[PDB]
């Protein structure tokens, strides 16, 4: 046979056979080596063996423990196969372990039954307790459906009239000789009824000697769902869909939250035939309408799409290259193929542009990140926000940016409703919508679970606040970004690019004060920020009376006319009296000339309105500049666009090394005190001032290169200041802990403790 | 004055003045006493003082610490007032503390300036560090906007031509004598430019000597947002909106997650005039269209709506009556007014009905919960799922139920788009939709933060799987119920009512195996559950061949006709040969009568098709019953509907006592070992078997009443088994901890420890 029929069935339905899955990983690892050899991320020759596989088999009955074996392919007795893989990758050359779980389409169409479910449970438990990432490939038909067959070949029917069966039947019963066979196995729950002239066993309930018929599959489905949620919280989970995912398997896919879909796949819950039976007419013609690429890639369930299974393996290893090898380690930092001292020569223009060109480049005018390092995940969903992963100097970075072009969104028709039609929606550039805000929160959550540093490029003028968007819950998804930023496990760096604006509640969302431990903000010299735009501040705070006062203060003709009116009023006050009323007549003339004075001082106040309106707008715009943001303390430092790469590289590297040593200091003090981040940073600063001196102690804040090189120097040596002081601090913490717990003891136990431990 | 003008301004705009806010709580507490005296939940007379208020004032400059004072009303220098209130409620008669935060409309329209932000920050920190609930009242105009006024008074312009100002201006500048006055205060960043014949100071930037003008309010707004998110995770937060909530305040409202809205309120992000200025025409005529009750109560941001501020205070204290007084205490259990031994006489019918009637009653045929205890929160949003709070025997319970009637949903028109029209959508009864699933997840989260027991009434046939609901992210909101059930902090009891079905992936969502520590499942005798409905299992697993085999096995005419065809086949086999071919003539007649035999055995197989289809449907329906679910282990016990109240009361009380004593056992061991729930329950069972006996040890599982009375008996006495063994295990844990932390020490340090203890 040599596994030919299983391969034929899997290839005919469109799936790589399960025991041919690991070798694909091997090939892609080899390809990465060759590409890195062309780029210079690694320089060594490719190793002879790049993958070592050990198969995990669960014990059947004792305690269902996981036993690692090496055996020939094709010997499975259940519907999933799991391996542990050691991969010798360019980013991790010594070794790196993952756990791979895959279904079997040759075994009952990949259905979910209990013995299949315990394999997933124990493999995900193994991946969680070893803290290594998990990759699941889904080829499934859903939960297992079954009908008991020993009763099916033996049940009898109680008729109203035996001559005419078409009228109806009363109950389903078993004869006594059938019950003599089936009574021991516990397949039926029955009642002894003497109807007509014979003893009959009326079937009340049907049970099976076999398992997997009914709700016992759905009991372990919730076990998989809870374990997949727990694995999402505790490790990095990647899911691949190749042919189909029906029902509960789809939920496991969404409980992975990182989904790669082949172009011929579908992720559905209810099949199209059942929906046409419910709706009564042939509404749907395929399951690709319900759950294909054009639905799941455009709503955000499927992150990336791949043409084949091998390309999906390549995308999975690309995503795995960014994350650390386990939860106790630092992110994989490659070598510097692209110089960090190079200029960033693609400047973001004021007009509408493509933000991916400022991150990658346009075959000249090189951009921010490394050449070719950029990978974006949810492209056709919520295209206002661009979310992806890249590398800066070899350091993995999560990237969020804002498209400044209008987005046309086509909402397709619903074929269940005849009146429904497709619609075109125009979405503005720099505005969070419900989908864009939910995308941003999802991206921050997914980068926070993998401990990836996030750099956000901030260009927002606010939220959407129209009636349709207020009905579509903009407040909820706006709050989810605040919660996601609050649950950050990595440094977050917000940077305002040239020509970008950060206004309104968007500043309140992305401010460093949401999570002060993990967030910083920087701005370009040509960056604007404020509560409102300039026209709104002119409407609310610099109104018509101020404009007219400005005209009477700075216009020469209005000054001279006002002086004329004042002298006329003095001429009124001096000439109070006036034969009788002889001096009256000139007063009348003066009144007309005073009407020539107040008028034509109104013609100047209407001719000069737009120019002092532009003075108002300029005066409002001078409050929005970067130097006021630096002086008020809202931003940390002003970084130019041309020198952004080097400075952010050294700052990110300094924060990574500093956070690692702060975790070591908090680990050392654990018996005595629960130490926060600030005392740990102060302790490292005190060791820095002890090692260097009081003259060079300012460089802890200013120089981000000297601190990082100092940390990498002091971490290696065991005669260093840092390691010796960590050992001394740990011993003092042990002393304080033992002192407290011996003061908490009783006088009776204390004497036993002293005499037994002084007896030695 | 006696605060008359401030009350006039607040009452004219429609808001209760801030120093009249506490007294309302007083009145409502008094009302509750009278109502409870009529019901019998309390018996004692009403206390003389039911509320004690102490005002919290932040220090201005030293460390911004909270100082508690008692002073005359009307002396605020900031726009927020905060108090700590001791309330002597019927559920908590001894005392109960909350923290109340309220804005001031009389102080700059309730705007958010930095000092107000620090009052909110420090008051919420006080509420979190005392672990007591927080109530906030939102009367706000948003973030504070400002313009520097000295530069506004004294700026000058540089003209292209001074004779004609209308052509344009070059820059905004200051004269030297103005710069001599304003140089020391740091209001301008300028450059010395000699243009024309005079020295000029070209204003590059404008800064203010005052604060609150710009982005610093947006900086402290993120501080409020992060603290409000943290307070949502750590304590219970309730928010009330009375006149308006604009901008960041709205987000704080959503970060409370429990919202009471007055009928004249609005919760908006952008005003109507700004949206009409963007859209260019008069689209909106009010802010009630963007943020009123008809939007927020129908999308789910506003939980409850109240006609006035007094009724909102009543609703807030109603919600506060369910939750415990602090995070270290057990839920308030009132006295038994309605007897727990009464029958539940409103049976849920098979037809479409109102699920509120089985929970409350219909002025006869009393329902499940207490009479009048039911309070539902989100009524007009996602009306498939009914979510609320009630009381069982005095115990607070969170309630989730399923409406079995078709819901008409009216989607209103969008005034921005001219082609938009209103739509009517029909939603089925027993199906999770995106809004219904998101409502269920929100309800489980809000009940889990308050440590309230949840009882779920499970009647679902699955999820919605059409193309429109797949595009509207059904999987995303279906996974959130699994995550919310996984993050449960309280006992969860799922019960299938009579006449209810739990089918498909809904069972996988609400199974006990998602969170086995906190979830249980029970079912009525007349309850159905399965993977699919019976017709689908007939399509998949009882097809045409099995039906025809059943006809040939159980129908008499087919049995006789098959025997006839068999005998004619034997007559074919015997007559092989056949003057020549003399016996061939009977073979033709046999062929005709064999064709007459095979036909009319096909007429019987088409006449009998519907009746054996009903036999197939009945045989499939017999697998879905309750006793199969009990025998397979999926449900815990079968509980009838008439006796559900007593049994669920005693089980819930047993779990509530047992979890508290398990937490005491895990607290006792904590120096030595981190103990899970299972060893704690086993330890309590071993103490139970030690006290009672080896014979009466089954009652730990069967009799909940005996376990309740045993735990409540030995919680009080200090000579009991439980208290003595807790002290013994704590002392042994201390001894083991000291032994281990001495064995981790160095030899030189150990000798100093020995001599310092032996010196005593």
Numbering used by the authors:
A (entry chain A), B (entry chain B): 1622 to 2199, 2215 to 2396
Sentences reproduced from the published study:
pmcAcetyl-coenzyme A carboxylases (ACCs) are crucial for fatty acid metabolism, facilitating the conversion of acetyl-CoA to malonyl-CoA, an essential step in fatty acid synthesis. In eukaryotes, ACCs are large, multidomain enzymes consisting of biotin carboxylase (BC), biotin carboxyl carrier protein (BCCP), and carboxyltransferase (CT) domains. The BC domain initiates the reaction by carboxylating the biotin group attached to BCCP, while the CT domain transfers the activated carboxyl group to acetyl-CoA, completing the conversion to malonyl-CoA. Mammals possess two ACC members: ACC1 in the cytosol of liver and adipose tissues and ACC2 associated with the mitochondrial outer membrane in the heart and muscle, whereas insects and other invertebrates have only one ACC gene.
